[PDB]
Amino acid sequence: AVGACVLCNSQTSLRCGACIRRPFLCCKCCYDHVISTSHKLVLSVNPYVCNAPGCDVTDVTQLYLGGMSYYCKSHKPPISFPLCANGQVFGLYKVTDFNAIATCDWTNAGDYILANTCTERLKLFAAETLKATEETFKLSYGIATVREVLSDRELHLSWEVGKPRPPLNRNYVFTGYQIGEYTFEKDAVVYRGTTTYKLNVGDYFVLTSHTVMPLSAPTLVPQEHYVRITGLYPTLNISDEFSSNVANYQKVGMQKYSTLQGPPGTGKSHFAIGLALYYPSARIVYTACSHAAVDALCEKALKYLPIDKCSRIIPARARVECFDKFKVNSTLEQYVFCTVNALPETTADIVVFDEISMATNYDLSVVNARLRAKHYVYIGDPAQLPAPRTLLTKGTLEPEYFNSVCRLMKTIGPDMFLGTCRRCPAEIVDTVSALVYDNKLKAHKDKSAQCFKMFYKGVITHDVSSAINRPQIGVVREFLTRNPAWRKAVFISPYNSQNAVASKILGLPTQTVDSSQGSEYDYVIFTQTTETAHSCNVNRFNVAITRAKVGILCIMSDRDLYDKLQFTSLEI
Ligand SMILES: [Zn+2]
Ligand SMILES: [Zn+2]
Ligand SMILES: [Zn+2]
């Protein structure tokens, strides 16, 4: 019952029994908590409660020390000291922001803003509290039981009354009863088991709520600048292919952590792998939140780094298929490729943390906890998509509050900017450069003259809250009859349910904007589906249209975003 004060570090025996995470608070801080919030339970070796038989007074503000023991006003002996006096709470060794973090329900943007503008120890408290609150909310959704099994990929579900039903997308992973993890898509529902299984009737599905470990390591270790490349040995022969990156590579070596903002198709992957070739003896751990981002770093590594010195870490509770072509789970290889959640406790010359817009402050802490390293490299794009905040329903989370790295990239700027898009037709590069990159992103490719926009609001139907626009798909179908090059196009929308309808009617492969992030395709068809905050978010829009290598068709609901597309407008 003895720890350091999460606000100021001062030793104490006071934790807040009201806070879900029960943080150690110093007497000066514990007071300013209890006297400002509904949080009145203080703990030490024993609870600060009235010790008189049958008395229920736990409010420290109505409590006194009578000898060794605590009493309320009604029970205290004549010789007693109140537990709250002169801005302190009686403890051994004798905050506005802490209070808002400790009591918020995390449904408001301002809660995430504060969890990212605050002091560094408060970012860990916030990150821990948020994640705790996120997991306890999963317990609020109704259990799903299998009524009947139609096919090997479709069944009929019965939903517990008196509890709400979860969104049936790829985000929401269920546990079958442990008969493998399962997702569902929309009275016929499409089921997808991790382990293939004759899905027994009576079997039930639940959202597994994993207990939240406390955090220790800061989001960002403290910054160190060096006069010379520290702890790394650069090649004197580096292939022309990576010549562009040498100054950035020397910056990586001359400070503790560095930030790389790389817009779509600007060479983030190339940069990350180019780092190993420039520091050829350096042990490098390649990490991201998702298997897809880590796999993408693997595909690049396979092309440039010796396969014998690469390992893909894969936890024995596997959830998707991972990259196969490396030795699996060899923690000691020079090159290690591993999701944040699966990181081993180890050291490294360089940690490369990729897709940083998708990381939470929880993830940034875990990494600094599990990996002791000479250099930390943070790669991604704050103009791209953050991790979903399942609890956030009010306000929009701006890129400067995604996590500590994005806040740095949005405030003091990134240490390094990849400024030339080599993926996208210039029509797309020019659109996004103006929209989210302050005109700093340059087109390598010419205009493709295969980038089209149509303003067509259509009709918005909903499967629950998930939007569908059949007329927008109708327009796409018409377009395809006259544009046969697009037969191979990937269909993209901000909505799973629009994607389900586009699958049936068009037969095109289908992606949400959020699932499309990090991928590229020759041709993209985008239906905005709706005018909502979701569908008009400039980051989501940016990702949507930068997936395309050759052509994009955008059926738009929003005038502002429509007019900004530097595309040939179509009629109908
Ligand atoms: Zn509290
Ligand atoms: Zn304190
Ligand atoms: Zn009492």
CB 50 within 8 A of CB 72: yes
Residues 6+ apart with CB under 8 A from 419: 263, 266, 440, 441, 442
Resolution attained, angstroms:
1.9
Q: What is the dihedral of CA 92, 95, 97, 102, to 10 degrees?
A: 40
Going from the Cα of 52 to the center of ligand 3, the distance in angstroms, rounded, reads: 5
In angstroms, the Cα distances linking 351 to 13, 340, 355, 365 are 37, 11, 13, 13
Q: Any bridge partners for residue 442, and if so which? A: 420
Going from the Cα of 19 to the center of ligand 3, the distance in angstroms, rounded, reads: 23
Going from the Cα of 95 to the center of ligand 2, the distance in angstroms, rounded, reads: 9
Buried b / exposed e along 479-498 (16+ C-beta atoms within 10 A): bbeebeebeebbbbbbbbbb
Encoding tokens for residue 9? 């570090």
Q: Give the side-chain half-sphere CA count within 13 A for 281.
A: 6
Going from the Cα of 70 to the center of ligand 2, the distance in angstroms, rounded, reads: 22
In angstroms, the Cα distances linking 93 to 16, 28, 495 are 17, 11, 56
**CA gap 220, 368 in Å, rounded:** 7
**CA gap 121, 279 in Å, rounded:** 33
Nearest alpha-carbon partner for 359 in 417, 288, 294, 418: 288
Neighbours of ion ligand 2 (CB under 5 A): 5, 7-8, 10, 26, 29
Going from the Cα of 17 to the center of ligand 1, the distance in angstroms, rounded, reads: 7
**CA gap 48, 43 in Å, rounded:** 6
Backbone angles phi, psi at 12, to 5 degrees: -160, 175
Encoding tokens for residue 140? 């609020």
End-to-end CA distance of the chain: 71
CB 93 within 8 A of CB 12: yes
Q: What is the dihedral of CA 473, 474, 478, 480, to 10 degrees?
A: 20
**Binding-site residue positions for a ribonucleoside 5'-triphosphate:** 262-269
Indicate which technique resolved this structure: X-ray
Enumerate the H helices of 357-448 as residue ranges: 361-370, 404-411, 426-436
Residues 6+ apart with CB under 8 A from 388: 171, 514
Location of structure tokens 């095109």: 508
Going from the Cα of 48 to the center of ligand 1, the distance in angstroms, rounded, reads: 14
